[PDB]
Symmetry: none
Subunit: 91 residues, 16 copies
């Protein structure tokens, strides 16, 4: 049973601190993660709006959430999650 | 005899409780389910609007419905269902 | 001689009664039917607007129509039909 | 020599009489016809606007025209015809 | 040496006479012709505007023009012609 | 060393004289030419605006230019040229 | 272990100094880098706006950033980063 | 090294034709293809987009060659380097 | 239901030709294709491999038709049934 | 959850009784079965040697074995079985 | 209703008379014929052994047989015939 | 890090006991397993020779071995193992 | 109507005279010919055995035969001929 | 600069100690390694003959060798090595 | 017109003199040549047996033959030649 | 002008000295080299038989030969060379 396969997260980060490169790298080292895509959607003066797409096998959301908090991020919204044996897409 | 293959559900959930991650995982473990996609369509102060797409083979709607109720969800609408030997599109 | 291959029906159903899941399942069990897609296009207070796409080989329209009536549905419009040895698209 | 391969017809039909399902079936039984797609483009109070796409090999237009007349249809326009060894697009 | 491969013709035809079905069939029987596509682009009260696409190998334009005249058609414009060993598409 | 592979020419021709069909055929017979596409871009009362695309291997521009002059054509503009071991797009 | 696979950088460079050709070449010689694409997005009188796309395996961002500074460039924005065993697109 | 160069180039409206120019660039070591297209033109100068692809393209030679043929590089719009061509 | 039937069939060396036989089988409901090939022949009988493919093939009709045409089924060598054709 | 996907069985059947056509049809109607291929490998005077390939989703082997016994068949050997989310070949 | 699609004929022809090239051309011009392949399998002193493969749509065997007789050929054997909506291989 | 991806096992089983169907099913339910192929290579009077191919992500060999022992099987040989981010094949 | 598309000829040629390169070139220049493949199958002391494969559209066999005779060749056998709108392959 | 891409090693290991599963896992976790295939080629009473195929990017042979020694293995032979920008075959 | 496209030559060369590398390079620089493959088939004490495959467009056989002679080679046999608009195989 | 594209060398090396891994790495760093494959074909007590396949663009054989000599290798035979705009196979 392959559990969580894709997470699409709308994430807020302070405009500086952990760069998104270092952030992408750390997430990619978690167990089950096969790929991470972080892209900037917008930014204020002090905060950065990020879309973080994580794909893999039995992704541990708790760990991912823990890592984002530690790096000063907040999850504003879980926009999409895909779970199971194969990836299903949205309408 | 492959019965139900795809369900597209418009679902209401309390803004907190069972996270949609845990909800997606649980549904994906049901017999016949090959994939689940949960995405947030909108949210009020206290409720979350979700589109839940389930695909598989002979999906048991009663079980899925039972599971969603237990997790505090309501089905507002069954938007699409596909049944039979292969997946037909709209 | 493969007769009818695709029917696209604009159908009216009472907002409750036979759920569209049970409806899709029955239709999918008819002879020649290889797939059914039912999706909700709109809904009033008391009626549901459905697009029912049926694909298969020598689909029997009389049976399908008979089944829809029995389940409380009306065919407002046959929007598309495909017949013959292969599917041609519009 | 394969002659006529595709006909795209803009057709007028009375809103009731021969249903387009029966019409699609009868056309699909003609010699050389490999598929028919009939779709409703629009409709008045008393007439139905149809796009009839016929594909096959050495399609006999006279027979098809004869059949449409007999079923109460008029050809408003032959929008596209394809002829020869292979299908060229427009 | 394969010569003319595609002709795209803008053709005028009287609204009745030879139907475009019979016209397509005749053209398709010419030597070297592998396919014909006739589609109606517009029509007045008495004339029909047609786009005739002919593809094949060493298509004889003289024969095709002769046939169109005999069937009451006029070539308003030769919009595209392709010649040689293989088809080049326009820009 | 494959030299010129593609020429895109903006060409002026008298509205009558050598038809563009004969012109396309004559160019296609040159050494190294693999295909010619002539299309009309516009036309005045007495002159025709043509886009001539020639593709091949070691195309001889001098010959092509010579041939166009002899057939009453003028090159208004060489819009694109591609040279070398393979075709690069714009 | 595989780390950073793609970096898309929005970069500022003085309108003259290290040419973007020499800059692309220098970056392409770094360990893990398999390809660099530098394109000009816009330019003022004294500064050049560049989009630098770097792809490879375990790309070292610190090295890349150091190199850009040394060549008189500034990173305005890291627009996209991809990390892990395989390339996930946006 | 260099796989793709996209150059914005100025050339006098006459002199070396862009056909001869494309041919001579295509004969350089490592060059696999050249595409020259006219983007615009004044009364006395021609605006050209020159796309060169190949393997370990020598920019100095290409630049040297263009100068010798009376051309100026207004702008290097895109360069691609490394083991594969990465797209923009 | 039945998607593919492979039949080992005996036919008298003359009577209904295998061309007419192939045509009449191909006109049955659900049949999409027939392939008849001669495997061997005695002085008075012909050995045929008849491959029929389609959707919900009616074996009784096919069997009935073959008998009527003077044929005997020596052996049903392969049958495929269900939503897809599974190969051997 | 998905279970048995392919069974390849070496089966003995009496040379007459249930024809292999009726046998293939019966098996193809079981839950989860998407296709059956029965082919004759050899035959004695009184017994028929069959290779039965069944494919589907969560195939119930107990049901299949029960059905074969009832039809007078014996399983000589289970030559191959495939289980899980996807088909692994040998 | 597409009828005969492929004929494979074992044919005897006198070693000279109508060449097999002219014979192949003449057969290819029949209605419904899309391709002919004639190949020599063997030859005596006075007769030629030919395998003639004809493919198309609603091939008229009577015409083909008539044409072969007129050209001095005999059909020794019809080795394969394919009929219906699509081509099945042996 | 996706660890063990493919195991090819040469396995001995008593000619009766747990059928290979039930055996394939149980293995396929283990965490990370995406597919199992069991095929009979040969058989004596009392023992069955099996090739068991397991594919997945971070396959736990200890668990698989434990399950085979419990079902009365012995691993005669681990013929092939594939580990890492992608499947590499043998020469 | 595309007529003859492929000719496979078993041809005898004197071991010297017109080289097979010049012979292939000439044939390839005939109307309708899109390709020629000449390969040596065997050779005696004074004669060369050739398989000549010609493909195209409405190939003129008379012209091809005439050309071979003029170049000192004999057609021992026409092994295969394909005619019509599309290529059928042999069995 | 991609350095070593493929190593094919003929390796000797004691019949017991570190299992080849654990060995494969450990090697797969090294920097640059994308895949490992270990297969048994033969075995004596006390030693195991292994073919270890490692693929990746800038594989560090010293580390791999160090790891194999630590796990009780000996490299009998480096049978094949591939280095550079892409994988070349034998 | 594209003339000669492929030459396959069986060539004899003295075991030393012009190395086959230099020979391959010089042939590849001829007009129309797009690729050369020289491989050793066998060798005596004093002579080398080579298969030279040349591909391109309007290959000049006289030049190639001239070049081979100058480099001390003899053409034992022209095994295959391909000519025309496209490459036919044997 | 792409010159040499592939070299296949039969090479002799002392059983120890420069390992074939270090040898493959050096060669892969030469200008124009895109890939190297070194595999052991056989070995005596004191010498190793190697097949070295080098691919790239305008490979400099003199440099490669110079490098092999310096590393204690001898070229026994150049088995295959490919030159020109593309790789042609034997």
């Amino acid at each position: 049973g392959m559990a969580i396969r894709r997470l699409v997260l709308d994430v807020l980060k302070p405009i500086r601190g952990t760069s998104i490169v270092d952030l992408a790298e750390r997430i990619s080292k978690l167990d089950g993660v096969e790929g991470v895509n972080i892209s900037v959607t917008d930014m204020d003066v002090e905060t950065m709006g990020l879309m973080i797409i994580i794909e893999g096998t039995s992704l541990n959301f708790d760990d991912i959430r823990k890592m984002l908090e530690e790096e000063g991020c907040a999850i504003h919204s879980i926009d999409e999650v895909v779970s199971g044996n194969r990836i299903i897409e949205g309408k």
